[PDB]
């Protein structure tokens with residue numbers, strides 16, 4: 475009762491079905507997005523709705539309003555693997571386990587055997603998506 | 612984005628101008644309008660640390676390098692100076708490194724020249740490439756080219772090595788799928804969390820990092836940069852990182868050798 479990284483179905487980048495079958499928890503989404511070892515989204519994106527996060531990056535436009543720009547399904551596909559929406563994007567795939575060059579074991583600098591653990595698990599993705607849906611207006 | 616500023620170091624023998632902004636080498640002309648030292652992307656308090664030798668914490672390790680250059684540390688009491696006299700004997704060398712050696716035809720980073728003398732001529736076990744003996748010695752040697760334009764050769768016998776480094780530079784490593792170029796080329800001037808991205812130049816190495824309170828070599832920097840893409844990294848002084856050092860050095864051709872720089 476998870477769809478595994480290699481089983482995900484992207485259609486024009488979008489993923490129509492829940493990766494877990496369980497509702498996203500947006501408060502946990504926020505934690506995931508602002509914790510360095512998890513989503514680390516704020517390394518590249520500002521989030522105006524979260525004013526207490528310090529040193530937000532300027533690599534990509536702010537996340538405010540992404541709830542208006544994309545459907546839930548689009549947002550799931552972007553979080554899981556943004557390369558299926560924006561070809562060659564600098565945004566890394568958070569639900570991807572193989573097809574890497576010199577795959578590593580965490581930040582150890584040692585070889586990691588593919589398939590790797592995905593950077594975020596399936597419920598973490600759903601949690602991030604549920605928060606992204608609220609970013610409106 | 613890179614600050615408007617100029618760098619002239621106060622020293623014991625007068626001001627030395629450092630070129631920190633200049634036209635790129637021809638191979639980068641479609642890539643950058645301008646190449647910049649990493650100094651330009653630092654805050655003013657950090658920039659000020661490089662502006663004079665009295666305040667530059669790297670000069671402690673230059674001086675210790677000079678002690679080691681003069682020390683009879685060989686098996687028969689040999690010292691660097693016993694053969695090379697003053698360290699000014701190495702004038703210009705740092706500016707043109709890495710290079711294909713004129714006599715052996717081997718690609719050499721500075722660490723390789725130092726260890727050739729250490730092992731063959733002083734009878735010593737090779738120094739670790741990120742050992743204090745090595746970082747201090749590179750610091751001392753690098754100072755002997757301060758203010759000289761970086762001018763690394765990329766054609767002729769250098770070309771295959773340079774090409775091998777170029778490939779590494781643009782390879783998107785690790786689970787994060789990121790290349791040197793993704794950060795240092797596509798995103799120079801931007802903030803990645805609290806860090807202001809530079810062009811990832813090495814004209815300023817060896818470098819005192821304020822974080823570590825110590826010197827760092829380009830080889831050691833590279834180890835960390837690839838590791839942090841969530842990848843299997845390369846060994847410091849490995850053939851592939853020697854090639855990368857050649858390639859990355861040449862991206863700053865025209866910038867001055869800083870001698871020993873200060874960074875976060």
Ligand code: HEC
Pocket residue numbers: 507513514515516517518519533534535536537540543549552553556560562563564565566568602606
């Ligand atoms: C942590 C999990 C996240 C989340 C939730 C998002 N990002 Fe990124 N992102 C990056 C770049 C360069 C782009 C633009 C794509 C391109 O044109 O190349 C994006 C795009 C997005 C979007 C869509 C754009 C929008 O705001 O509507 C969304 C919703 C999104 N991201 C969410 C870059 C990065 C990173 C740099 C390495 C990091 C880390 C992240 N993104 C992380 C996240």
Ligand code: HEC
Pocket residue numbers: 680689690691692693694695701704714724725728729732733748752
């Ligand atoms: C003490 C540890 C040192 C250090 C730091 C260096 N040397 Fe030597 N060196 C010697 C000879 C005959 C050469 C070759 C000269 C040539 O190729 O024409 C070298 C070379 C170097 C280099 C490279 C110089 C270059 O221009 O290619 C460097 C950086 C270097 N050395 C540093 C001779 C001796 C010795 C005689 C026995 C002794 C002792 C040392 N060197 C010691 C040191």
Ligand code: HEC
Pocket residue numbers: 648649650652780789790791792793794795803806807808809810811812813815818832833836837840859874
């Ligand atoms: C691919 C292997 C490389 C190489 C060769 C380099 N980098 Fe990075 N780098 C990143 C950040 C945030 C910093 C600190 C801020 C800055 O000065 O740019 C660096 C630093 C460096 C340096 C030091 C430059 C100096 O002037 O002291 C060098 C030589 C360097 N890098 C080389 C960030 C990233 C990445 C972001 C995720 C990636 C990928 C790379 N770097 C990759 C590489």
Ligand SMILES: [Zn+2]
Pocket residue numbers: 663665666
């Ligand atoms: Zn001073």
Ligand SMILES: [Zn+2]
Pocket residue numbers: none
């Ligand atoms: Zn010489």
Ligand SMILES: [Zn+2]
Pocket residue numbers: 714
């Ligand atoms: Zn010679």
Ligand SMILES: [Zn+2]
Pocket residue numbers: 775850851
């Ligand atoms: Zn190789």
